[model samples]
Target: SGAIYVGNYRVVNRHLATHNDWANLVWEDSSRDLLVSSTTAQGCDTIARCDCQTGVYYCSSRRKHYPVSFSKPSLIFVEASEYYPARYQSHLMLAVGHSEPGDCGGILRCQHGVVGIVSTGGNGLVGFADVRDLLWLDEE
Candidate 1:
């Protein structure tokens, strides 16, 4: 409902199970950061990717084809100091996984110094041909 992309999002196993469900939502709780909640399989690793300047939340997981589960709905904490640049603009990439179970994978593209959900890959697929933007600090 604004110039920026801010809202609730859900991650579901629509293809795997009918009982599996998970979701996250963002509200206008001030102009600093956005709140989020997520649900996924048991032992499912989740990560919050955000654009500090724009406050967009991109949540993803690396556990695929597992027992479907969901996280308790709550406003999760997001750390930008570890993901975003302070003085200059930079790209952001959020990845979730434990390396033991190769089930989930995804990549987010941030173009023009802004972050966005580019795509999500599953089932240990190791071919990412849609990396259209940079997710790192600009080189001066």
Candidate 2:
């Protein structure tokens, strides 16, 4: 009952718990994926509320499709409250991977189940936030 953006239709009723960016959590309304999040580094403030029909990202340069980039960097967790601020620390968990800065909101799908959301990455290591925890914030 706490998943967001699983398919075209609703599988669960929930919104992203952007604990890192507490101020961004106005508990805004969004039928679109949480990628429209404003809490993230490249996260857009307006995209989440736009009327939607269909949208696509075609990268002719790579001859491949890339998702809208809204990834947050890992160091944001360590940001000082004065210079930078987030409600929680998000870089505690780091994994080994090739993911760099821009791949922030991508999922870490594993063999059995998805690992989590790409929170931060660099130097061949990446950090992800557990989706279940993110989704279950209200209940927990």
Candidate 3:
């Protein structure tokens, strides 16, 4: 996997969902500072897009798409700060289904921006699972 730095910190890829394989871009453990994925919010199976240069990220469901635009001026400087790690962790859990068996979750290390899969069952951390087992929709 390739690495994308957000400011001085690396943006890690947690690989939280199977649909990540269907993403338009290459998968990296630490590539984009922001990540978007399928969720019940829009009734879509999965959609993700990132524009580090613009400080924006987007996600869509089967029905609608959502976009989040952040302040780019301070993003690099605050990318590794404590402001986002907890939120990122929660987002990971929501994306992958927190308590479901066979589901996955992950986190971002604020200091280094390290990302990886974490077990909700308390089994500890693991690498990204096979995308084939988790995908439910065709690539768009």
Candidate 4:
């Protein structure tokens, strides 16, 4: 499974592939933009901060924890688009086109921006977890 660093949490894909039951909190968070310049190779700009809707900070390049809860929140159309350029279209080519066990937590980007997370796929069809529906689970 692939991994995505969000809010200090090392979130994988399988946990949120289908239905989930951990929406104990509402989705509302924070963050800045990743550098778009070709020279600034660091993904830290978008990868360094917490999620704007999930409130989970990307505190480290390698996150310190795992999902405390099963809440894979979904984002509305508008919010997802806003979060897109939050980072570059990660693996746009591979995403719209799949090939291996690499099916989870990858960012789904449209012409809009970061829209969703790769949930599962088959027959060349891939789905994603909506960023707006994701609720923040308290680590405590």
| Per-prediction tally of clashes | 5, 1, 8, 18
Question: What is the C-alpha lDDT profile of model 2 across 1-140, one tens digit per residue?
Answer: 12233322112112334444344433332221233122222211111222221222222223443333223323334322231234344323455555543454544433223334444445755445434333432221
Give the range of the ten consecutive residues with the poorest summed lDDT in model 2.
43-52
Shift of residue 109 alpha carbon in model 1, Å = 2.9
Give the per-residue lDDT digits (tens) of candidate 1, residues 23-136: 243221121222222333222222234323222223333323221112222233322332222322122222332222122122222323223321222243211111112222
Runs of candidate 4 with Cα error greater than 4 angstroms are 15-96, 110-113, 135-140
**TM-score: which candidate is best?**
2
In angstroms, give how far residue 76 of model 4 lies from its true place.
Answer: 18
Question: How well does candidate 1 score on lDDT at residue 86?
Answer: 34
Residue 138 lDDT (model 4) = 14
Compose the digit string of candidate 3's lDDT tens values, residues 1-140: 22223222222234332354335333332322333243322231222222121111111111212222222221121122222232222222212211222322222122222222222222321212112112222232
In model 2, pairs of residues that clash are: 71-104
Q: How close is candidate 1 to the true structure, as a TM-score?
A: 0.19
User: What TM-score does candidate 3 reach?
Assistant: 0.20
Q: After superposition, how far is residue 123 of candidate 4 from its true place, in Å?
A: 1.6
Q: How much RMSD separates candidate 4 from the native structure?
A: 15.4
In candidate 2, position 26 carries an lDDT of 31
Which scores higher on TM-score, 3 or 4? 4
lDDT for every model?
A: 0.24, 0.34, 0.25, 0.31
Q: Please give the lDDT score for candidate 2.
A: 0.34
Error of 2 at 1 (Å): 25
